[PDB]
Write an enzyme that holds these catalytic residues in place. Structure first.
Site, mmCIF file in Angstrom:
data_model
loop_
_atom_site.group_PDB
_atom_site.id
_atom_site.type_symbol
_atom_site.label_atom_id
_atom_site.label_comp_id
_atom_site.label_asym_id
_atom_site.label_seq_id
_atom_site.Cartn_x
_atom_site.Cartn_y
_atom_site.Cartn_z
ATOM 1 N N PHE E 67 71.206 55.330 63.436
ATOM 2 C CA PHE E 67 71.985 55.789 62.294
ATOM 3 C C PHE E 67 71.366 57.091 61.801
ATOM 4 O O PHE E 67 70.632 57.098 60.803
ATOM 5 C CB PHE E 67 72.007 54.744 61.185
ATOM 6 C CG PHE E 67 72.770 53.512 61.527
ATOM 7 C CD1 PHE E 67 74.129 53.444 61.296
ATOM 8 C CD2 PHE E 67 72.130 52.409 62.052
ATOM 9 C CE1 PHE E 67 74.838 52.304 61.598
ATOM 10 C CE2 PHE E 67 72.834 51.266 62.354
ATOM 11 C CZ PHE E 67 74.189 51.214 62.122
ATOM 12 N N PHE E 72 67.764 56.000 59.592
ATOM 13 C CA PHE E 72 66.976 54.919 60.165
ATOM 14 C C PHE E 72 67.638 54.468 61.458
ATOM 15 O O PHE E 72 68.738 54.901 61.808
ATOM 16 C CB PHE E 72 66.844 53.739 59.199
ATOM 17 C CG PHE E 72 68.151 53.076 58.889
ATOM 18 C CD1 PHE E 72 68.716 52.174 59.772
ATOM 19 C CD2 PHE E 72 68.827 53.367 57.722
ATOM 20 C CE1 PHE E 72 69.921 51.588 59.504
ATOM 21 C CE2 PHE E 72 70.032 52.773 57.446
ATOM 22 C CZ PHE E 72 70.579 51.879 58.342
ATOM 23 N N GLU E 74 68.480 50.758 63.707
ATOM 24 C CA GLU E 74 68.548 49.308 63.716
ATOM 25 C C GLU E 74 68.032 48.785 65.048
ATOM 26 O O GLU E 74 68.507 49.203 66.106
ATOM 27 C CB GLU E 74 69.982 48.845 63.485
ATOM 28 C CG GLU E 74 70.154 47.363 63.527
ATOM 29 C CD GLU E 74 71.597 46.958 63.426
ATOM 30 O OE1 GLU E 74 72.464 47.802 63.715
ATOM 31 O OE2 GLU E 74 71.861 45.795 63.057
ATOM 32 N N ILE E 75 67.048 47.895 64.992
ATOM 33 C CA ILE E 75 66.591 47.146 66.160
ATOM 34 C C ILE E 75 67.449 45.896 66.282
ATOM 35 O O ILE E 75 67.417 45.032 65.400
ATOM 36 C CB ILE E 75 65.112 46.764 66.031
ATOM 37 C CG1 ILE E 75 64.282 47.993 65.689
ATOM 38 C CG2 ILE E 75 64.619 46.119 67.309
ATOM 39 C CD1 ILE E 75 64.252 48.997 66.783
ATOM 40 N N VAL E 76 68.188 45.785 67.384
ATOM 41 C CA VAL E 76 69.190 44.735 67.541
ATOM 42 C C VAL E 76 68.691 43.592 68.414
ATOM 43 O O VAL E 76 68.663 42.440 67.980
ATOM 44 C CB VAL E 76 70.494 45.311 68.117
ATOM 45 C CG1 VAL E 76 71.528 44.220 68.239
ATOM 46 C CG2 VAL E 76 70.994 46.437 67.237
ATOM 47 N N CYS E 78 65.637 42.414 71.401
ATOM 48 C CA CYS E 78 64.271 42.761 71.767
ATOM 49 C C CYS E 78 63.718 41.622 72.608
ATOM 50 O O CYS E 78 63.507 40.530 72.087
ATOM 51 C CB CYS E 78 63.442 42.983 70.510
ATOM 52 S SG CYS E 78 62.157 44.184 70.670
ATOM 53 N N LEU E 110 64.666 49.437 61.035
ATOM 54 C CA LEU E 110 65.086 48.257 60.295
ATOM 55 C C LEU E 110 65.484 47.175 61.284
ATOM 56 O O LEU E 110 66.061 47.465 62.332
ATOM 57 C CB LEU E 110 66.250 48.577 59.348
ATOM 58 C CG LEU E 110 65.909 49.387 58.093
ATOM 59 C CD1 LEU E 110 67.142 49.736 57.311
ATOM 60 C CD2 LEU E 110 64.951 48.613 57.212
ATOM 61 N N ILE E 141 73.551 48.020 58.972
ATOM 62 C CA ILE E 141 72.911 47.041 59.838
ATOM 63 C C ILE E 141 73.556 45.685 59.600
ATOM 64 O O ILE E 141 73.973 45.350 58.489
ATOM 65 C CB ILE E 141 71.389 46.984 59.608
ATOM 66 C CG1 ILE E 141 71.075 46.522 58.196
ATOM 67 C CG2 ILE E 141 70.767 48.334 59.841
ATOM 68 C CD1 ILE E 141 69.624 46.413 57.937
ATOM 69 N N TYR E 144 71.941 38.822 59.713
ATOM 70 C CA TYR E 144 71.940 37.582 60.471
ATOM 71 C C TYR E 144 71.438 36.463 59.576
ATOM 72 O O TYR E 144 70.467 36.635 58.834
ATOM 73 C CB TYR E 144 71.078 37.687 61.728
ATOM 74 C CG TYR E 144 71.558 38.751 62.683
ATOM 75 C CD1 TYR E 144 70.962 40.003 62.710
ATOM 76 C CD2 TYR E 144 72.625 38.519 63.536
ATOM 77 C CE1 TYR E 144 71.401 40.991 63.571
ATOM 78 C CE2 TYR E 144 73.072 39.504 64.404
ATOM 79 C CZ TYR E 144 72.453 40.740 64.418
ATOM 80 O OH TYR E 144 72.886 41.734 65.271
#
Lengths: 162, 160, 163, 164, 161, 161, 157, 162, 156, 161
Positions: E67, E72, E74-76, E78, E110, E141, E144
């Site tokens: 973004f 920042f 976003e770590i989706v 991993c 994030l 983001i 969850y």
């Protein structure tokens, strides 16, 4: 400093042309009675390709092969590692790299006509004298010769060769 | 026979002739590394006078013209083993001389093994170099242990 | 780590070959830190000058900056540096050897250089000599004379593989 | 709900709904077949010379038949054949095979070959396959991936009746 | 060998098969997420994945959505495949990811970490204290259920790689 | 039935006639908003409408305005023709709208609801507790006094259709 | 004596000469059919040229994807026969096919000609599969289908 | 019994090529003492044309001629009907179609040097030994073969020849 | 009367001729699904020798050439009832055969139903199968109850 | 079940085989009208046919010829295959045809009906009293000696589908 390259004559690159001259040199030496002119015509035929064994930008071996994706097999034509670099495991790496190259192209059969002097290498690499392919599918494409031993290798596309 | 000035830029007939030449040079000068003979024979600024017998290379002279310096480097000279003592070495050199006369290059320079000195002396070469050292040094490749030879060409007399 | 050699020159568009160049400008100007940095910049970024860059994982570690004179038969070695972070690792030799094979493939068999006091050892190490074979009439006025320094020469052999 | 049948597959050039359907099919085939490498199943589903008849419910892939046509020889190889666990015993397998039969009639290919594992033979028997191979060995050997455990089965297609 | 490649769509099919490998790995290690959801994001154009390749075969990756306007990333997803965990590949992966982002002027990560992933992100510099304003990440983001918002600030003067 | 996301682009004889239909049903289920105002928004290039069409006839729709930079979508007009009511068409319309938006990475709906719409938005999952900050929506969505702002958050992993 | 593979003015005249020589030395067949094959741009003819005039030739069709060549027509004109030009013609055709890497010759040949094909190395034992030449070469009561296998390990000229 | 009259010639398409070869075969058979190469060189000369007599797609006869529009006459060079289609009136119709063709191209005189064996056919077709064209107009354009008889035909544009 | 070897390639004079042929094959073979007859007649690699009186279709032979296997499949043969018993069916087969001598091929195979036996016999077809099953299998469309019949060619 | 208005315009894979099928259906429910005639009309460019496609097969159709310059349309052929009759397909075909013509402002159908078609046309709203002047159809519709001229007048507000 070893790498494997599948090269061939398109007609661009010089290193390829020099590599193909190196391959022609290698093959032509190890296989004297075959005319130099003939080995060159095969190596420089576009429908032939070579998996080249490269060390420090230098050709030390390779396999010249001819794919027949219409028929479901590849012909193994020339197969050599230069005399100084033999007995180092290079002939096996060359064949295994050719096997994985071929399963990724949905060809699962190698066919070759071998001298008495090559049978042992093809045996070691998993080739067999029991030809599952019918004669009506390879004869006339691969160069048959009186006194040569037709040998076959079946590739298992479920195992990673490299 | 057929005489051709061939080189690298396509055409496959020519390219298979180059491989033939490379095998002849590499065979007759086992001295030289195979990969080195290949690198020159396929160098674009290098070209070769190929001696053809029925679509088949039987001899050649690989040379590199330096038109800016006014001379030519004779790099490789070979007639295949089973075809020598027929006069082909002389006919090849002469064709090369007339080729260079038509391009206003009248000096050949070569580094010769003493296996080759006899041939060049009988083609008209000499050890007394008229071309100044400042015109050729670092242009021709120096092979130590060989002796530098030079040939001056007469543009008025015919060679073929 | 991954290490690479490429001759990065300059024509007339790439991203990091430039940033490699300013790095090269910095390492030369860091290990040669009394010649004017602008001079090093003008040479490093000159079009007819090239640089054999020694790069690993993107960062620039070493380079040899050179200007080929193919009409005159020689190349000038202007700058030679490995960053002090990675000296004493045989990279000075790997650099020069890749430079040697590059020039053999371009039919340039003589290097000429003017060496300061702190680089003569490196050139002796790499085959250079104080006995010059290229005539004066062919290098004078072409290579940057820098004469508080030593003219050294290296003749290459086209037969052998250096790399 | 909204049962769809689509013959999809990879091209050398090019669509994205198709790509996600291809990933789903790779997930179903792989899950249903866990000792075969996932990478090999991926390489086949995404091979351009392979096509798949995707069974679509609500846009989500719930089943498929992965096949390769050999028009030069006159048969097609059935490669992978699966329906999602929670959608089985709903008669979808038969509908999948019938659309494949119709699709191959229209293209002048009237023989299906397949090397069935023991867990698939019952399905192929109910869909009209047999262990009596009319296609000559001289024709499929080397084209279809043989395997030293599988059972070669054949299905002959009637081009005059409609299978749908 | 180990390779790192930032891949995505525009693509190829050495890339597509790498993406399928990545999707398979993310789905096995995150049985939490539906398989079609993982595929949609891994194959979304605005998403990228740092793929960890060994022997030409996918063994791990970090799928992220950048973004740049919001400042920042976003770590989706991993993951490292089970056979290669506990070899320090998860930290090499994040390191190469931080380097990739330093060179794009993105210095804030994030992520939403499930109960099981919080420890890992702690080891990689993430915290539960979020200095990015809620007005700038909410709606961008994906939340969850029951996970924990965690954030990592990057230093542009460290070359993590 | 058919669900079509249509909208006027800055052409297609049919879709405009549909748009005229949606303008009509919007104006006749809200019979005192100036029809001129409904027309300008229905035919605005940045508004689009999920049209509920049966046998080629417009029977319902939701006119909306997406704010991807801001992270949400405005619900502007929402209606089902008076005949086809009380058959679950408004929920299926809302569900296709949610599916559309989750595939477009927009996970928040915002709307201003009148007397008759509150119970509908409650039905469909809307709430009067607004998670989206006032700095993110004020001035972008068309405000009313008296009407009630309502919000819906979408879960991107369940399928809504 | 010059050899040319052909199939320009000089060439067209040469192909009419080949059709004339073939149709005379093989009066069985329609001159119309002989001409059709001679002038097919896919059939080729190794022409035997002496003083610029056609005195013989071999008309053939290469099928490089199937690895053979069909020998359609073989003829030397009568006042040049016993000079052995038929053998030099066949050697030039073999050598030419090795350079283009094709190693099986196929021909349907008259009893009037089989003896020649044996001196040139052909046999009636057909190693080549039927599913190879079927539909590519043309049948007659050519008494025998005949095959010749070529060995690249030997220059043929 | 499908018969066809076509005027064909070599451009300075291939069933013209096959018809030309049949015509060369016809003339070559009828004139075994002329060299067949000479008959070929003429039949395939672009300056020469041939009125082809076709039956069932097969040349059974023809008249090979060269038009000299600058000189106002045409030379009949070759003229033949294959020997089992003879005495069917085809020789007459071949020459009549040639007459119609030439009056629609504004040429009113045929000239020919005739064999002993050909004179009677020409006489049957209205040719005459009395040459009205002046010698300055044809001599050297057509060849006076020693022993041939020069003959002429004067055409009428008012006559419908077909 | 004209004979034309026609078909669909990728033209309406041809097109109504195709539909005409499809009707004649449909009427004479009256319980074969006409969707199938049309599917083949309009298949771009099936061709039909149209026997055309007036400029309209009064007969035809639909066939399917298979070179690499050395034979052509005869699928459809019909002369409409008005012009029956003038031997048009035999003229058709003669134009087919001769078209096939100039084109690649010297064998005919066909699956003949109970009513087609006579025509093929008089055209020279036989019930002995000198083509091995190793080749017609999978190219010609097998018909269950029908009888496979073969015709060896006249060459030229 | 689908409806398509098709025909030769100046085809594709679908429509041509569809028209061959339509010609077969028309021909066999008019089994002694010359088939050459039925094919020429079905494939005539100025002729169109509303096709009833059950799935991929043609099971019925109406071949019509529009005379928009004269204010009417000629019904040429009208048929449902033997399987699917007395299933209500004939009416839905005619109604789709009626709406198609309403959208083109052609509100009169003229047709010449034989004995086996009068009943059907009566059931579809056709009359024997022709309000279109004979000054207007004569020479445009193909007459049929012995057939009954029948007319249907359409209402442009009526939605038939």
């Amino acid at each position: 400093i070893i790498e494997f390259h599948v090269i061939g004559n398109s007609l661009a690159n010089r290193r390829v042309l020099l590599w193909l001259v190196g391959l022609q040199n290698v093959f032509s030496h190890q296989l004297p009675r075959m005319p130099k002119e003939y080995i060159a015509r095969l190596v420089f035929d576009p429908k032939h390709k070579t998996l080249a064994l490269i060390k420090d930008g230098r050709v030390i071996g390779g396999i010249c092969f001819r794919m027949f994706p219409t028929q479901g097999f590849t012909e193994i034509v020339f197969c050599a590692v230069t005399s100084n670099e033999q007995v180092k495991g290079y002939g096996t790496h060359l064949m295994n790299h050719l096997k994985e190259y071929h399963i990724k192209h949905n060809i699962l059969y190698f066919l070759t006509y071998a001298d008495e002097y090559a049978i042992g290498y093809f045996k070691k690499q998993g080739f067999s004298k029991d030809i599952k392919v019918p004669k009506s599918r390879y004869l006339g494409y691969i160069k048959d010769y009186e006194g040569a031993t037709l040998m076959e290798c079946e590739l298992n596309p479920r195992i990673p060769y490299t």
